[PDB]
């Protein structure tokens, strides 16, 4: 119900690189709340755009003369800088920036701030575009991410880790029931866990794929990393051997049907048969108790709470 | 600007000069000029504790500090 | 002629240091040829520095120089940075360290020295012949070279050391080809294990084992070759008992090997398929061996997890070996993870749970030493960057320990160069550039971090250097397996059972105690009941009683007053029983030290010493802690004389206060003005006990002890000291070893502010009381008040003026009474004591001419009046005549009434005591004149003959009582003491309180403060003590420093590392009561070595009075008023009284009435 309004009086919804590619502004300051970071989405844009960035990290006098001299040189000739954390170097970005700032057609600055850190500077804030980094909230949104970013076994593998990935996100943005604590599955994971899986189908050449190795590692290793209580390591343990348990036969999704690949296919059709697969599944709307085989009270509870305090927030703006 | 300042001042009010500023070399130029000034004023002060405590005097005696 | 024995020695010493600075200098550029042209300018000050040697030498065998000399020395920057380039392991030894190693350009022998500091695990090089053919490690054993390393007059330090480099890890291959060799022949490895490098062992073992695997893997059997090993194992257990020492830690070593490859061997048996075998098997680290490499230095490979990592085959020595946990597996396949793709394996849970061990552990699997370092709230950007470009040309493994420590500017700072190191190791970069300056990087290396969350004081990691890293939680630790296993290698006849009741037991005992905050029995608990079972093996033998003999002595000390009576119940209804050692030696050795230093050899007391003798036998740190005044120093004091006494071994201590000093000054500064690093006060110890110049430090043990207050941010830079690292890790990348006769204390109050990574780590010693009788310390006090000074005579009939039966209910009684300022009567006997001393041996010179009646009365008067003014000596008037009524009631002797006093040879009062003022009218501008009354007489009489006894002061009242002013009265009569005054501030600290005293004293050597005068004492009057703040960790420094100054005697110079004497200065001190706001309460550490008394407001009569002499003074001006002198008196007192009942504090904050406005 309250994405409804945005799926029906909203036709259009602008990503990090919409906003980079219509904005007249050459100064944009990223935001994102405390334990994740949007440095790798402007890798990528990067990249895409063919650009060089330069990460300089702010926090020392060293770090500030070379970034003085980088963006006086970005300035003459052209090219992408960036700065990292400039909360930790307010004094500078008080002084030197909001005067550089206040004061070429391929210079481009990207700053990122904290949003629970301390106050930046209003004129230097105004005077530049916002953008603020966030998860997905749409579980299928974030598999059709997953997959836009990235024999047919590999590319297979490959769709199996991006819906775990996704599942185990939307899990975990469920404080009480989800997991014991707030943890956080960033990019990183997923390279890890994609590198290990390519690293096991290209040393087992004889198509009997170990699926206990490859659940264990990523239940263990690369996913259970940050895990600390034990329920959280068995409940991503079970999670693991529901979506990567290798059956010809595979129900990720009480609606969805994935067919396990041939011996006769190329890559390049099987991506195509695994998108269509992908783009026939429709959302359903209790997809936050359904997919992810949780009780439905814990949810109930938790969209109601969420909905109680949107709604209070917009009856108490709404009134002036 | 910052509470060193107001120690320094709580330093001159409470005493009647600061020991800080005075150290060392700057001590010596101290004595040495207020040896010289004390025998061009024509007082007869050698030793140091005696020469001190005149500046104590003279500086508690012509010295207001306004907050 | 002490003073000028003294000066010689100062100047023998300054010749030493100038000597070995030219030698220094002559051999880096004096000496060698050719040498002279990188540097023209600094070839031209060294030939003038030649020259002031050559003048100064003709001079002595017939200051300036030293001066030009450390002048020259910063001219020598870039020939060390460039010298260091040459040779990448010189990032972690000194400036003056390489000065030595360069300029020792054909002694080869100052290498080995400084080799422990390179290497890591190689303390001496066995040279024969000017050739090198030993190289020994730290546990002794001698690695035999492949070939001799010849020696030449020409080469300098670099170009040999890295042939000796390159032929350790030939060397280390050639012995493990051979050993591989007689594996694959069939032999035995008993005969292998006394052989060869531990190294070769146990990797062909290892390399075997993987063999042999994957060869029952390919079938289906197990029985046969778990049965091979289980015998092997017995074999090894067997020859275990009958051979040396290398050898025995050798086979301990293998063992533990051979030990988990047992545990691998079970697990693969047991199972039932094939698929979950092959899991087992991939999980587990497998060695693996090319046969087509030609190369020889990467022919054996480590597989885990289908990724492969390359044995660098560095010598690692004997190192102790951990126990192969579960755990210790998946943390081996996440750092084999995070290093198939050059990241950085991170390491992060509760303290004392195995991640520094683990990492160490790692790297020695993989065959290089792991250097460690220890991140500090000092480390900023370019010392970290320092230490990264240093390990990337090595290419040995860095693990920064702790590195939560750093400031978070620092540690998004290093995000880019950690980034930069990553990316130049994936892509296979041949330089990379940091400080603006290219070096070469080794493909070699990696970085590894262990983060300790959750903690106070600690900053969190910005997400994009956390990204750059793969966290691994060390929860839950593998207690049990850990315990059962090192059992069985220590030869026990059951492990199992008793490893389970060990572990069992610890639970019991961390779940059903009084949960307080320094309760902690994780892993670190368990590793040091271990430690100190193994030695008690030669006095109990290995079974139940010494495992229990083990836990008491290394519990029973940390534990509460109901927490040892729960310990016993548990230990006796989980184990059998409890022969008790005799220990009859140490606790004569014990008594005998007590009879020398007076102390009272009481049950507590001896229980503490045998306690402390016990956890120090093999505990090298240990934390004193209890309430303000147990007899911790005492008690640390008379085990140090009784161990002196008992072995014969020379003990020498350092008292050193550690919120005293900054961490610039405690641990040392890099002075940014020159790149140029100044040592601190501890690092100065370390580096001089290291050194070993004298060579009278071999055989005498050395102790520092801290006595203060455990800040974390001042005792967590010790993590790499206290624990099994005991390597100190400068900024500038020094690293002092910890000598195993170094043995660090701590004495303090409360443990609330400090961390479990500093308490699990050292032994702990909880005083839960009092150790001492009252009796016996009155007693001692009279002891050392007798031996601080007929005589005889005298000391007899002052000793039985005591009657103790009569004092401890009076003792008893007093704790009715109101206190200001909260300190126990246990503290408050010291002034007692020493007034009733001093006061005797003042009045002894009229002693010899009365009878013994009137003798006995007045020793007793005297008595009365001191503890009077001891016990109720901060009270108010109605406390003070109540606790006089109350000591005249407890004692035929002389009463004492409010104001009895001997008079100069009877009873009389201040009645007749006072005397008339003839105040002028020009006088009152004078800021000392003093109307006396009873009061002021008396306070200033007592003020007088306190200070007189060589104490300290404190006195205490509501602002304008006349604190100062009595004071003042009292000193400015006298001809002996001189006043300066200081005034603190909520920002006072111990420079302004030096600088206040440098234009009053002098420095003389004997160092000594003396006061100026020869003659005069010099009281030192610190005004205000209340007002200097706490910093964030409830600490103050200039209470502490006054602490330090009326105690000890002393304190540590700050620029120069030495220790000064005070002689004749006394601290005298006021401060307002702690309940008025803006007041701060202050540590019972401090007011336990002063008095404290009591200046009240005086009665509105006396006021009346004393302004009644004011006003006359004031109307002999005009002379027809003199009969209104006391109406004026009257109405200004009333005015006062009426302004202060009326207009409180309540109203504004500046409201504070006194007489000063009268
Ligand atoms: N067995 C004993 N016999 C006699 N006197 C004793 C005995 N034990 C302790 N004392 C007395 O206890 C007093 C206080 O003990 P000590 O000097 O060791 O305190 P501390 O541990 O340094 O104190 P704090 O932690 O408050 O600074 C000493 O002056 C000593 O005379
Ligand atoms: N096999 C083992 N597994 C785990 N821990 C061990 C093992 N053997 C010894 N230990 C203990 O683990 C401790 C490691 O301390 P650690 O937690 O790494 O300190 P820090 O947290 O400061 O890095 C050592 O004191 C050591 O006694
Ligand atoms: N003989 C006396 N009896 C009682 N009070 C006195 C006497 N002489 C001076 N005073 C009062 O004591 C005050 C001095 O207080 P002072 O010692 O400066 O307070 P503080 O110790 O807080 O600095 C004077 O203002 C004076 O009014
Ligand atoms: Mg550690």
Not at chain 3, 127 to 140: A, L, Y
Request: hydrophobic share 40%.
């Amino acid at each position: 119900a309250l994405n409804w309004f945005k799926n029906e009086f909203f036709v259009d919804e602008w990503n990090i690189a919409d906003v980079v590619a219509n904005s007249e502004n050459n100064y944009f300051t990223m935001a994102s709340e405390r334990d994740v970071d949007g440095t790798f989405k402007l890798i990528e844009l990067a990249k895409a755009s063919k650009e060089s960035l330069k990460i300089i990290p702010l926090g020392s006098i060293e770090n500030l003369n070379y970034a003085q001299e980088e963006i006086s040189k970005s300035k003459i000739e052209g090219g992408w800088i960036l700065l990292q954390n400039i909360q930790m170097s307010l004094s500078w970005v008080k002084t030197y920036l909001h005067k550089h700032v206040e004061e070429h057609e391929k210079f481009k600055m990207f700053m990122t701030c904290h949003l629970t850190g301390d106050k930046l500077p209003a004129p230097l804030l105004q005077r530049t575009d916002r953008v603020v980094y966030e998860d997905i909230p749409g579980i299928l949104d974030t598999v059709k991410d997953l997959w836009g970013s990235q024999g047919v076994w590999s590319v297979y593998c490959t769709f199996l880790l991006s819906w775990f990935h996704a599942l185990i996100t939307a899990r975990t943005r469920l404080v009480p029931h989800g997991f014991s604590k707030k943890y956080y599955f960033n990019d990183c994971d997923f390279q890890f866990a994609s590198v290990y899986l390519e690293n096991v189908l290209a040393t087992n050449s004889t198509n009997n794929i170990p699926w206990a190795q490859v659940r264990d590692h990523i239940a263990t290793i690369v996913y259970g990393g940050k895990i600390d209580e034990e329920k959280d390591l068995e409940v991503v343990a079970k999670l693991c051997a529901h979506v990567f348990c290798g059956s010809d036969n595979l129900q990720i999704v009480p609606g969805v049907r994935i067919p396990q690949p041939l011996l006769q296919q190329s890559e390049e059709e099987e991506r195509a048969r695994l998108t269509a697969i992908l783009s026939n599944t429709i959302e359903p709307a209790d997809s936050l108790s359904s997919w992810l085989q949780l009780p439905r009270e814990s949810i109930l509870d938790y969209e109601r709470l969420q909905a109680k305090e949107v709604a209070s927030s917009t009856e108490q703006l709404l009134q002036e | 600007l910052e509470t060193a300042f107001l120690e320094r001042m709580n330093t001159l009010l409470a005493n009647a000069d600061i020991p800080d500023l005075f150290q060392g070399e700057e001590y010596d130029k101290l004595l040495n000029n207020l040896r010289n000034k004390t025998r061009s004023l024509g007082l007869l002060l050698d030793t140091e504790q005696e020469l001190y405590d005149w500046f104590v005097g003279e500086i508690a005696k012509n010295l207001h500090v306004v907050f | 002629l002490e003073s000028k024995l003294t000066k010689l020695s100062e100047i023998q010493v300054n010749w030493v240091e100038v000597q070995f600075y030219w030698l220094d200098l002559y051999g880096i550029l004096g000496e060698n040829l050719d040498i002279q042209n990188f540097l023209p300018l600094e070839t031209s000050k060294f030939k003038s520095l030649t020259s002031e040697y050559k003048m100064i030498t003709t001079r002595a065998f017939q200051k300036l120089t030293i001066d030009s000399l450390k002048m020259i020395k910063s001219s020598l920057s870039t020939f060390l940075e460039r010298q260091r380039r040459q040779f990448p392991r010189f990032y972690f030894l000194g400036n003056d360290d390489l000065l030595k190693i360069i300029g020792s350009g054909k002694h080869h022998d100052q290498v080995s020295k400084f080799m422990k500091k390179m290497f890591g695990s190689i303390e001496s090089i066995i040279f024969f012949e000017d050739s090198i053919t030993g190289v020994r490690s730290v546990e002794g054993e001698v690695l035999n070279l492949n070939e001799k390393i010849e020696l030449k007059d020409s080469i300098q330090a670099q170009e040999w050391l890295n042939i000796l480099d390159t032929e350790i890890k030939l060397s280390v291959f050639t012995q493990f080809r051979d050993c591989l060799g007689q594996l694959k022949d069939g032999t035995d490895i008993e005969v292998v294990v006394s052989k060869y490098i531990f190294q070769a062992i146990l990797l062909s073992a290892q390399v075997m084992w993987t063999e042999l695997v994957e060869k029952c893997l390919q079938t289906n059997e197990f029985s046969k070759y778990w049965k091979e090993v289980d015998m092997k194992i017995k074999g090894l257990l067997d020859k275990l008992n009958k051979s040396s020492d290398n050898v025995k830690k050798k086979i301990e070593a293998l063992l533990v090997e051979y030990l988990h490859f047992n545990n691998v061997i079970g697990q693969l048996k047991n199972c039932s398929t094939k698929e979950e075998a092959r899991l087992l098997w991939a999980k587990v680290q497998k060695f693996y061996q090319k046969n087509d490499t030609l190369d020889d230095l990467n022919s054996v490979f480590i597989s885990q997890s289908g990724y492969l990592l390359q044995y660098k085959f560095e010598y690692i020595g004997i190192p102790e070996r951990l126990i192969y946990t579960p755990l210790l597996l998946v943390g081996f396949a996440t750092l084999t993870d995070s290093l198939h793709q050059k990241y950085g394996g991170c390491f992060f849970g509760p303290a004392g749970t195995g991640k520094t061990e683990t990492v160490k552990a790692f790297g020695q699997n993989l065959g290089r030493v792991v250097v460690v370092f220890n991140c500090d709230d000092s480390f900023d950007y370019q010392v970290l960057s320092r230490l990264l470009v240093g390990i990337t040309q090595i290419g040995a493994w860095g693990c920064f320990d702790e590195f939560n420590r750093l400031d978070e500017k620092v540690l998004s700072a290093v995000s880019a160069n950690i980034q930069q190191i990553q990316n130049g190791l994936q892509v296979g970069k041949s330089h990379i550039t940091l400080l603006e300056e290219e070096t070469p990087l080794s493909p070699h290396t990696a970085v590894f971090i262990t983060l300790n969350p959750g903690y106070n004081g600690r900053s969190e990691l910005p997400e994009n250097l956390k990204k750059s890293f793969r966290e691994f939680s060390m929860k839950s630790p593998q207690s049990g397996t850990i315990a059962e296993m090192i059992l069985q290698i220590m030869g026990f006849e059951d492990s199992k059972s008793l490893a389970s009741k060990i572990v069992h037991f610890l639970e019991l005992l961390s779940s059903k105690c009084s949960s307080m905050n320094h309760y902690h029995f994780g892993l670190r608990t368990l590793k040091g009941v271990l430690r100190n079972c193994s030695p008690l093996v030669s006095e109990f033998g290995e079974g139940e009683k010494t495992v229990v003999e083990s836990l008491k002595r290394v519990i029973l000390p940390s534990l509460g007053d109901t927490d040892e009576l729960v310990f016993k119940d548990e230990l006796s209804k989980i184990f059998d029983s409890a022969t008790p050692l005799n220990s009859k030696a140490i606790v004569q050795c014990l008594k005998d030290a007590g009879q020398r230093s007076g102390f009272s050899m009481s049950e507590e007391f001896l229980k503490k010493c045998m306690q402390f003798y016990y956890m120090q036998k093999t505990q090298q740190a240990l934390i004193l802690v209890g309430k303000a005044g147990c007899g911790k120093t005492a008690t640390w004091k008379t085990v140090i004389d009784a161990m002196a006494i008992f072995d014969g071994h020379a003990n020498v201590v350092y008292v050193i206060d550690t919120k005293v000093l900054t961490k610039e000054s405690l641990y040392g500064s890099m002075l940014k003005a020159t790149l140029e690093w100044r040592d601190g006060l501890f690092t100065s110890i370390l580096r001089r006990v290291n050194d070993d110049i004298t060579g009278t430090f071999k055989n005498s043990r050395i102790w520092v002890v801290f006595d203060s207050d455990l800040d974390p941010e001042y005792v967590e830079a010790m993590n790499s000291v206290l624990d099994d690292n005991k390597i100190l890790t400068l900024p500038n990348g020094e690293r002092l070893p910890i000598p195993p006769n170094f043995r660090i204390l701590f004495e303090t109050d409360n443990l609330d502010h400090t961390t479990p990574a500093t308490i699990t780590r050292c032994g702990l010693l909880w005083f839960s009381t009092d150790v001492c009788s009252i009796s016996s310390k009155i007693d001692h006090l009279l002891n050392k008040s007798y031996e601080a000074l007929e005589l005889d005579k005298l000391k007899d009939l002052i000793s039985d003026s005591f009657d103790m039966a009569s004092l401890t209910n009076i003792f008893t009684c007093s704790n009715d009474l109101v206190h200001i300022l909260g300190v126990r009567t246990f503290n408050k006997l010291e002034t007692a004591v020493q007034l009733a001393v001093h006061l005797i041996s003042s009045y002894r010179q009229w002693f010899q001419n009365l009878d013994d009646k009137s003798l006995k009365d007045v020793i007793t008067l005297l008595i009365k009046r001191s503890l009077l003014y001891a016990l109720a000596g901060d009270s108010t008037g109605e406390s003070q005549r109540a606790f006089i009524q109350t000591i005249n009631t407890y004692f035929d002797s002389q009463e004492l009434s409010d104001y009895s006093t001997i008079v100069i040879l009877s009873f009389s009062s201040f009645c007749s005591e006072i005397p008339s003022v003839s105040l002028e009218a020009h006088e009152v501008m004078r800021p000392d004149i003093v109307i006396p009354t009873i009061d002021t007489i008396k306070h200033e009489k007592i003020f007088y003959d306190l200070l007189n006894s060589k104490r300290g002061i404190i006195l205490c009242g509501p602002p304008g009582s006349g604190k100062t002013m009595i004071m003042n009265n009292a000193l400015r009569n006298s001809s002996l003491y001189d006043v300066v005054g200081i005034n603190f501030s909520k920002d006072t600290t111990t420079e302004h309180i030096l600088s206040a005293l440098h234009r009053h004293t002098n420095y003389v050597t004997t160092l000594t403060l003396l006061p100026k005068s020869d003659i005069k004492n010099l009281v030192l009057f610190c005004d205000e003590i209340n007002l200097p703040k706490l910093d964030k960790y409830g600490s103050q420094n200039v209470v502490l420093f006054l602490r330090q100054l009326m105690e000890k005697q002393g304190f540590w110079k700050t620029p120069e590392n030495k220790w000064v004497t005070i002689e004749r200065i006394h601290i005298v001190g006021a401060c307002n009561p702690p309940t008025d706001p803006g007041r701060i309460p202050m540590s019972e550490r401090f007011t336990r070595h002063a008095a404290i008394l009591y200046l009240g407001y005086p009665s509105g009569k006396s006021l009346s009075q004393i302004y009644e002499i004011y006003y006359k003074a004031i109307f002999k001006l005009v002379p027809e008023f003199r009969s209104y002198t006391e109406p004026f008196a009257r109405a200004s007192v009333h005015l006062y009284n009426e302004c202060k009942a009326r207009y409180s504090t309540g109203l504004q904050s500046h409201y504070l009435f006194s007489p000063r406005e009268l």
